[PDB]
Amino acid sequence: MKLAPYILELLTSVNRTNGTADLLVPLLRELAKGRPVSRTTLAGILDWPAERVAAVLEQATSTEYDKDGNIIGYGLTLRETSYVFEIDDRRLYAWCALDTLIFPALIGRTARVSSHCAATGAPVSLTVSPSEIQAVEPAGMAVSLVLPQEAADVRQSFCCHVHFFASVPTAEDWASKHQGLEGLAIVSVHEAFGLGQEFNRHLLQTMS
Ligand SMILES: [Br-]
Ligand SMILES: [Br-]
């Protein structure tokens, strides 16, 4: 289907005033190491004053912190979710299915991704590299999409509705009971991977 509306609103969400756009890729590569990331440490990687890191993170209200106040989660997270994202034998997590498709290209790693079907609980897994997906199991895997909401925080408006499914027909039966979500749509995991590629392409080009 025509996914331009999802690309557009996802980009608008990160390019929004005080958006995450320019800190997102450096933060994700830092979290991919598997350790908490201090705000001060992130500021030096970015060469931003502390107040700028703070304003971005303050707007990103779903950012996850540990007991020491360090960053442990923003899309990619050290805190368990339904989306397992394993790099180099380190088990990390992601906030939603589409995140697992986007991150490999941004952090330059291949991930073994696993979850369960949101409609049936069936195990699903695949290998996501910067350029391709492989070992899609089961092969007909599907993803749900919704329209990101203006100014809303991404995780409650978008992430918590963006799931893996065992198949497009299973997913479409599930969707038929959730028509109250804005712009709900079902795509194959391949089409979702293509959407994330377009997101990443716009993201990287709009980066200093
Ligand atoms: Br369209
Ligand atoms: Br995002």
Catalytic: 117? Answer: no
Alpha-carbon distance of 31 to 1, in angstroms, equals 33
Calculate how far, in angstroms, residue 107's C-alpha sits from the geometric centre of ligand 2.
Answer: 14
Residue 76 phi, psi (nearest 5): -95, 135
CATH topology of domain 1-208: Beta-Lactamase (3.30.450)
Residue showing tokens 């368990």: 80
Alpha carbon separation from 38 to 28, 48, 135 (Å, rounded): 13, 14, 36
Q: What angle do CA 81, 75, 5 make, to 5 degrees?
A: 115
29: left (phi over 0), alpha (psi -120 to 50) or beta: alpha
Delimit the domains of the chain by residue range. Answer: 1-208
Alpha carbon separation from 107 to 43, 111, 117 (Å, rounded): 18, 10, 26
Alpha-carbon distance of 71 to 203, in angstroms, equals 22
Q: Identify the active-site residue in 47, 153, 159, 173.
A: 159
Residue 169 identity (one-letter amino acid): P
Calculate how far, in angstroms, residue 203's C-alpha sits from the geometric centre of ligand 2.
Answer: 10
Looking at the DSSP bridge assignments, the partners of residue 111 are 128
Q: What is the CA radius of gyration of the chain?
A: 16
What is the resolution in angstroms? 1.9
Calculate how far, in angstroms, residue 75's C-alpha sits from the geometric centre of ligand 2.
Answer: 7
Classify residue 61 by burial, with Cβ atoms within 10 Å: 0-12, 13-18, 19+. exposed
Residue 101: how many CB atoms within 10 A of its CB?
Answer: 27
- Interacting residues of 86 by C-beta distance below 8 A, sequence separation 6+: 92, 111, 112, 113, 114
